[PDB]
RNA sequence: UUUUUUUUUUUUUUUUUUUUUUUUUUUUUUUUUUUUUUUUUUUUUUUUUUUUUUUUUUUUUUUUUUUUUUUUUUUUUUUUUUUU
């Protein structure tokens, strides 16, 4: 989403969501990431 | 919840028998008579050293493979209604 990077973070809660949407997408990668990263975006999409 | 019954009535002394009578000493036999020394045999005569063989002759490095490829949240139900 375009407005998810100009967005404006000032509460407390909206920056620790926002965060763990960062992290948990990340964390996704690591499980096929060595196996069979090419064959991946699978079970990513499964995962998010 | 509960509804019955739940005293007693007979009999219950005794009657026989219960001393004793036989037998119960003894009579035989019961010493002994044989046999019972000895007569053979009983030294020895073979054999008994030795004669083979007994070193050795092969082989004995190595040649493959040896990462991975899936899946992995959840979706129902879950008071009671008698009798006593």
Same mark, same amino acid.
């Given at each position: 989403?375009?407005? /998810? ?7 407390? %809660?909206?920056? $620790?969501? /926002? $965060? +763990?949407? +960062?992290?948990?997408? +990340? !964390?996704?990668? +690591?499980?096929? /990431? $060595? *196996?069979?990263?090419?064959? /991946?975006?699978? %079970?990513? *999409?499964?995962? !998010?």
């Amino acid at each position: 989403d375009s407005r /998810a990077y100009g967005l404006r973070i000032t509460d407390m %809660s909206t920056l $620790v969501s /926002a $965060v +763990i949407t +960062i992290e948990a997408q +990340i !964390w996704i990668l +690591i499980a096929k /990431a $060595v *196996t069979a990263p090419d064959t /991946a975006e699978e %079970s990513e *999409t499964r995962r !998010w």
